[PDB]
Structure formats: C-alpha cells, structure tokens
Symmetry: C3
Subunit: 193 residues, 3 copies
C-alpha cells in the first residue's frame, strides 16, 4: 500500500507515522492533541449566573467567559443589575483552588461545537502554588434599554484565600443600574498537557 | 508493518486508528476536525468597508474582525470617519440571517495562513431560529492624526427576528470626526461542527 | 486490515489517508498543521519588562501578551509605572523587523502546555513590506493599590524605523502614577504557513 501525507512510511523499520508540525500539534499519552488548544469556561447558553452584591439585597445576572489562549486567560463578563444604585457593588466569583470549579454558580467547559466538554477547569487557575497579585480598573459605560447612563469604571482583583481563587469585581455607579460589559487578561502557569 | 503513536494498530480486529484527545479533536462526517477551532470573518487586508451614517452625507472607512472561539464572537471595529460632527452617528452592519454573509460590504473567512477559506460564515450568527435583541455601550476615544479629540461612547445593538442579522453601532461625538477603535463580545448558539 | 475514521483506504490506488476538514486543519511540507493556530508572544511569567519614559527618570514594569488568531493580533499590556506625573509618558517597544524578536526586553513564544516553543515570532509583524501607520487611542483607568485615580487615555502607534517594528504607547496622566492595563487589535499580513 501507499501512505498519503501527512501519513508517512519508514522503510527502514516498516513503521507508519503521522507527520505533524510540533509547535501546533503534539502527542500526549499516545494520542494526538494541540499545543495551544482553545478552552472556554463559561456560563451556559441562556443560563446567566445569579450574583449578589455582598450582604445587600441587590442581585444581578452575569454571563461569563474565561478563554484560554496559550497560557493567557481572556476574562469577559456581562452584568445586568436589577437595582438602580449609587455606590460601589462587589461582584465576587470563587473557584476551587485545585480543580478550578466555579463555587459561585454554574459554569462549564464548552466546545465550539456548542457541546459541554468533560474537562476539569484547572486551566483558569493563575498558579499551582496558590498565590497571585493582579489588580486594575477598566473603563465601563452603564446603560439601560439602549440609553446612555454613565461613563464610569469597574475594578478587578485576583487573589487566593483559604486555598481558593477569587476574581473580585467592583463597579461604581451613580443613580443607575450596573449594566455593563468588561473584559481583561491575566496569565496562567498551569499547563494544558 | 508497525504504527507509531498517535496511530494505533489493533491486531484483535486488524484495524488501524488515530488516537486523539476528544476535548480538543473530533470527527466530523468521517474527517478530523477541532473541538474549538478559531475562525475569523473580516474585511480583507487593506480593503476597509465603506459605511454611511444613515441618510446623512457622512461616511467612514471600517476594518472589521469577528473572531470566533468556542461559542463566543469577539467583534472588533476600526472606524475612520471623515466628517467633523456633533451628534450621534449610526453605523449599521447587515448579515444574511441564515448564512451570515455580510451584505453591507465585502468580508471573508480568513485562515491563519493568510488565505481565504471556503466556509459559510454562520458562526457569527447569534441564533438560527430564536429572535434576539441585545444592546450595550463601550467607552471610546476619538482621535485624529495621533492627537486626542474626545473621550466618549459607542453603543452596540444585535437585532434578529428571522430575517437578516443586524449589528447597529451608534457613536456620539462633539465637534470631532468619529475615528475610534471598539470591541465587544457576544455569544453564538451556532455550533461549529 | 480495516481503517477507522478519520483514516480511510482508497481501494483503487492502494493508498491510506488521513481525512481532515480543510478549513480547520491542513498539510504543509507533508506535515499536519492547523489552519488558524493560536500563537502567543509574551513576557515570561513573573518576568516583566523594564521600560523608561523616553529620556525622563521615570520607569515602569510591563507584562505584555501578543495573541495571534487567524491573521489578527490582540496586544495586551499591563503597565505599572513608578513615578507620579502630570503629562504624557512615552513607552516604546522595539521588535526586529525581519524576525519579530523583541529588542527592548525578553519575550518568548509560549504554548498552551506552558513550554516555550522554538518558533520565530514573525507572526506579530504587521506588514511584510515595512510600511504601516496604524494609530489610535484607548480609554484607560489609572489606579494604585486597588484605589481609583483617573479616567484617561493612552495612544498606540505601529510604525517602522530603520528597518525595525515599533509599538509606541503614550499614556496621559494628571497627578497619578501611570498604572493601567490596555488592549488593542491589529492585523498581520504575515501568513503562518
Ligand atoms: C440602591 C443603592 O444606592 N445601593 C448602593 C449599593 O449598590 C452599593 O454597593 C453601596 C455601597 O457603595 O451603596 C448603596 O447606596
Ligand atoms: C455635521 C454634523 O454635525 N452631523 C451630525 C451627524 O453626525 C449626526 O449623525 C446627526 C444626528 O445626531 O446630527 C448631525 O448634525
Ligand atoms: C514628574 C512628571 O510630571 N513628569 C512628566 C512626564 O511623566 C511626562 O512624560 C512629561 C511630558 O508630558 O511631562 C513631565 O511633566
């Protein structure tokens, strides 16, 4: 028989092989995998996460995507608060510091096929040694039903406590509902192998 | 003959197979594919789209990239307006509601190779058979020739009711040209299979 | 013997093949590769680059990621300035115009596995023929130790000078340290082949 590329036949030892570009593809436990696969940990379709502003009776819906490109994580959140507010709201997400599972609400690893993947979400975790400093602010615009309300900001802060990973967001509003989209990037040293 | 990993020969049923990591690779109609491929639907290299501000005699050039990963679309637009304006401009993009093809201007599915891909861009559509309306605002900075002009805002709006798919952007300016970059994210329930 | 999908045997030319979806995977030089692979050029984990505000005695630490998907680059920077300032600071990154290698400080092509890849970072270069003038502004928020300081802006400019590729960023502050994260997107006409 013949082998068409990318299959090749080594006459020197009667071996059929798959040739692949190693920076892009790899072998892991005898199976073909990607060097830099895209993995997304997200809230499901039509299932936003319910969040509470600390101890207040102020709630919001949040759609969340955490996207792994190489070793970077792109974090996106879309928040729809139900209370008009003047102050700073704290929207806190907790994740198991070993497995990555979201403790705050329902998230899942989702393929581009639209199907849930049976994958433990360690890939969102910054460090295997459970320490991290990262904080900053992003500019945001709050609106409601297509109407501009306020140009303001939202902080983000990555921490560990009690061995779990926290992403704490804080939005500042003046007489408007916290309804906004914000994203930022961070780095993971957890390898996908 | 022999097989080297990730290929595998089964002497039991005399079958040669490819072993692959299922959360990263898959089979689609007998062919190897990715579980989470990156696709980009964009204006061609150095071929910005012409956009008209409603019925006004006011135009802009636009470079657009719509980057699909997992089930998320990252929309990025580079708008270069030509008329100094005070008011709100409306930039409307229209896409075929079934195929995703841009009707407002020329866009192509572009691989990392730099080659156009022969792919129907259904992966930018938010849904196939569910009416959709989603709006938000992002902060922007208008500039001209490297010089700051105004910190302001642009709304985005996704509309669909089983005709065409619309992305409607509204920039608000005060005595400057609408010249800005802006991105936002949205979900597509169209699986890539 | 039998072949299991995605392997197939053409009874006719006695050839065994790997079937694959061409918009997702491809063959280059007889080797399997991706059509739109993810590559990331970045500062090493916990090894920020040292930058200077032009000739002033004002410095910043910078974490940088340059994410290539399709032909688009997502540039992200986390700038941690050390000196309170009122004015506009200039932060300049310089890259070899042929190979893409960062000349300002150490950066590396990092796979999803957490391993450095042996690849030339040409995939960050905007134009093959060394003529480009992409510039714009992004809104940013300066903070310190998790406290808000200022809503402001930062320009970006992609140029070539003396055969090398420059990304020049200019942050404008009023009585605060230049401490912010910012991102922007641009197009690379260098195909990954
Ligand atoms: C209805 C209302 O104003 N609620 C806000 C609340 O959103 C914020 O978390 C808090 C502390 O800043 O201040 C309250 O006044
Ligand atoms: C020349 C000028 O200012 N044109 C603006 C236009 O850009 C805006 O779309 C419209 C409605 O707000 O108001 C017009 O007057
Ligand atoms: C200490 C201080 O204010 N330094 C700023 C400097 O950051 C800026 O690059 C320069 C040009 O605007 O102006 C100086 O006043």
């Amino acid at each position: 028989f013949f082998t068409a590329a990318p299959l090749s036949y080594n006459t020197g030892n009667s071996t059929i092989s798959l040739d692949y570009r190693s920076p892009q593809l790899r072998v892991s436990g005898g199976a073909l995998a990607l060097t830099s696969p895209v993995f997304v940990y997200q809230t499901p379709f039509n299932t936003p996460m319910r969040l509470r502003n600390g101890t207040y009776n102020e709630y919001a819906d949040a759609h969340i995507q955490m996207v792994r490109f190489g070793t970077t994580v792109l974090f996106n959140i879309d928040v729809t608060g139900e209370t008009n507010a003047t102050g700073t709201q704290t929207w806190e997400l907790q994740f198991d510091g070993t497995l990555g599972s979201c403790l705050t609400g329902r998230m899942q690893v989702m393929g581009g096929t639209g199907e849930e993947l049976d994958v433990t979400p360690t890939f969102i975790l910054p460090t295997s040694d459970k320490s991290v400093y990262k904080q900053g602010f992003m500019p945001i615009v709050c609106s409601e039903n297509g109407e501009f309300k306020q140009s303001t900001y939202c902080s983000y802060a990555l921490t560990y406590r009690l061995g779990n990973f926290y992403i704490t967001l804080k939005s500042t509003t003046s007489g408007c509902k916290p309804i906004f989209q914000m994203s930022f990037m961070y780095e993971s040293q957890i390898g996908i192998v």
